[PDB]
Design a protein around this ligand. Structure first.
Ligand SMILES: N[C@](CCCC[B-](O)(O)O)(CCN1CCCCC1)C(=O)O
Ligand SMILES: N[C@](CCCC[B-](O)(O)O)(CCN1CCCCC1)C(=O)O
Ligand SMILES: N[C@](CCCC[B-](O)(O)O)(CCN1CCCCC1)C(=O)O
Ligand SMILES: [Mn+2]
Ligand SMILES: [Mn+2]
Ligand SMILES: [Mn+2]
Ligand SMILES: [Mn+2]
Ligand SMILES: [Mn+2]
Ligand SMILES: [Mn+2]
Lengths: 306, 306, 306
């Protein structure tokens, strides 16, 4: 079992400084030793340096850094594609969530029937025509879903992307801050999600059971787990740019990761939005990074029973 | 849909200074904007000034401020009755829980077939003959329930009350600190409650389903939600006078409020016992007020899925 | 109902200073008054003074303080045995968990059909041949189970010990940090456990139901509850030597204790591993002790509904 680790210090999908230091923070929290201990053979690609784009002006006076985000993702997709082609399960450390455009695109090149489990407080499914922030980290799913493409304009730097997956191939877990146009999109395209309210009702065991029935109930598929640290309650993961009260507990997050491992199908994992500079103390930053490491290790087989 | 907001700075139902500043704290936490955003047409009645009573001596060398609490409640009931009669769902900000004598009396004055959901760590059902504290905020339910009246003596300032509400028409959620005579009362009059232990067993979904089956399972009735902030765990709502460990989680509180909204029958709401002065820090005070706003907004339709 | 309280300031089953002050901390937190209030008739044995053993050198160059732990446990066993035969339910305050060798041995002397509910983040079932720490507090169960005796070497000071429990007569609740050879032992000997993951799946109600079906489903038996404070999440019980993230909530711990009380069969209880010196503040120490008192009081009938 081989795992590739790619640092992707994306910050230009959003406006808050510091998220580019997430990969270093997660490595410093002992990621590689934890993975080695489980028996993973590792290839560390280090932290990538992405090519900047000069004069990357706003698109439509709103969308920030489109060419930079587009090119960084094109470059990242090439690395992810190569790693998956070489037989590695691919762990990408962020960095802001716009990097999922690149990781999912790269992953889908060799694994076109992948499915996506998107664990997040947010749906990240605004389009360039619905976003009220202009921040691409709150739009990445819109660029990836085939059914949405007539509603998504062509951004500069984005021409290389071709939507990778169907709306029936993504399931959200943890949602508790969704913009009204995103709610419209989720309902209109029948995209399945388990919000925090659904977890309150069903419990995390049934949520995972139903997630897998929707995605792999009738056929095996490589799983892409895109995990935004802000899915966790801010008491547990304070070092992040968009915290929302009332999130996953520690135990719920471990359970999600355990079930992902138990499928035997995990093929790529993103761990995004750790921003150590937003912690009010070193302890806050380190606990957030420690939590990120626990998620990744659990996703690759660390158990709570020995 | 129209909502009236009434500030009721009651503090004489108990002995701790500061709870009279609860209404201002909740307002400063953004209550009105949150309600407007949901589509509520608002009538703000401001913070009421209640008429004092001279020489309001203890009743029976025990019960504190009886005439002051009686008259403040009589005055409050007049405002609540007018608001409800004019078509508003009536939100009353406390202030200590003795104010529910006035809000429920005033609500019932217009809506005699109302039912009550009482969310609290405490049953608040001592009578003047069973209370060990003498504090009227731990007695309001005894003045309101028809079946209990042959056991409730007449307090000065209390003669105006017309307690018609049946013991079958109140359900408690959250109970974890109940005095022995209150336990006797709950059992003897077959009053239904879901204690924290019941929530541990059933889960909040089934608790809400069972609550509504009891109250509105046979017929539609206006709902009065009387919500003591101390229902929440003290880690979440520290700025309150009688905290008890082991309370509702944030998610459970939001779920209760969401289910109240989903009935379409919410007619009045009390949010009581926020005391900003009992916070150890500005942060503790503000988080308690923010939580109060979240409960109110969720009760009028704020969702966690957009 | 009569309850003996025994202080057992064991520290030599592990290496961290301070756990010998656990019994005093629990008493200072109001244990005796809480038990009296429930109607318990009390015999306080005080804190026992155990006979030291000079030159208690490492066994096999690894196992720490074997003669001291063995002798202290032999002495403790005599006290517990006498107390149980005099008709007391026996509460032993720790002290490190190696004391359970003594309490369970003493208990079983007059109650051979006892069963054991072991509430803990850890399985405490290493043998002298599997331990990697050498600390006897992580081994007590191996000395007590009949089925394991061909794999447990004779330690100096341990000759008085006869295993008196079958592997089918112990159930674990709370497990989340289990060493690989302990996992092998649990599986190989079909020892039943409900890990944190099992609690996440089933809920604490179902966990207790299944626990009692396994132990007393066919006949009434005296129950020995051995409760390591580290079963609780470290946010709730920080003052302990081996904290592990993702533990029982306050409510889950109360529910466990309530269900133990509800059986009517509680015969002895250990409350171990409170180490006030490991608190980083007096508040942390006090909350851990207060929690210990809550567990013991709930196990003897304190309710959350009055
Ligand atoms: N929907 C947001 C989401 C930002 C978080 C992105 B993720 O999950 O990668 O971290 C936020 C929109 N905003 C919410 C608050 C009110 C105004 C709109 C957006 O910017 O589009
Ligand atoms: N039962 C109490 C309740 C006080 C809280 C009122 B609420 O819910 O509005 O905030 C307290 C009685 N007291 C409990 C602790 C032990 C002594 C008696 C009382 O004073 O009657
Ligand atoms: N399994 C441990 C358990 C110690 C806790 C004892 B109890 O529950 O009474 O508090 C720990 C072994 N250690 C765990 C971390 C990795 C190395 C081995 C041991 O020392 O045997
Ligand atoms: Mn997010
Ligand atoms: Mn995201
Ligand atoms: Mn209360
Ligand atoms: Mn109350
Ligand atoms: Mn332990
Ligand atoms: Mn232990």
């Amino acid at each position: 079992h081989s795992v590739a680790v790619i640092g992707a210090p994306f910050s230009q999908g959003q406006k808050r400084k510091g998220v580019e230091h997430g990969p270093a923070a997660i490595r410093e929290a002992g990621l590689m030793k934890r993975l080695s201990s489980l028996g993973c053979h590792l290839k560390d690609f280090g932290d990538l340096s992405f090519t900047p784009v000069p004069k990357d002006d706003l698109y439509n006076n709103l969308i920030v850094n489109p060419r930079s985000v587009g090119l960084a993702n094109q470059e990242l997709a090439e690395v992810v594609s190569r790693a998956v082609s070489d037989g590695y399960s691919c762990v990408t450390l962020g960095g802001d969530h716009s990097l999922a455009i690149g990781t999912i695109s790269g992953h889908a090149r060799h694994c076109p029937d992948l499915c996506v489990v998107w664990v997040d407080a947010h749906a990240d499914i605004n389009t360039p025509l619905t976003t009220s922030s202009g921040n691409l980290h709150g739009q990445p799913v819109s660029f990836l879903l085939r059914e949405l493409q007539d509603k998504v304009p062509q951004l500069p730097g984005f021409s290389w992307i071709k939507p990778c997956i169907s709306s029936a191939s993504i399931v959200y877990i943890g949602l508790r801050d969704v913009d009204p146009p995103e709610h419209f999109i989720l309902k209109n395209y029948d995209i399945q999600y388990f919000s925090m309210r659904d977890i309150d009702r069903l419990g995390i065991q049934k949520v995972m059971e139903r997630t897998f029935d929707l995605l792999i109930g009738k056929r095996q598929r490589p799983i892409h787990l895109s995990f935004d640290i802000d899915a966790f309650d801010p008491t547990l993961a304070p070092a992040t740019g968009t915290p929302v009260v009332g999130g996953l507990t520690y135990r719920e997050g471990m359970y999600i990761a355990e079930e992902i491992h138990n499928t035997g199908l995990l093929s790529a994992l993103d761990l995004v939005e750790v921003n150590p500079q937003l912690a009010t103390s070193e302890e806050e930053a380190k606990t957030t990074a420690n939590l990120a490491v626990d998620v990744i290790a659990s996703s690759f087989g660390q158990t709570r029973e020995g």
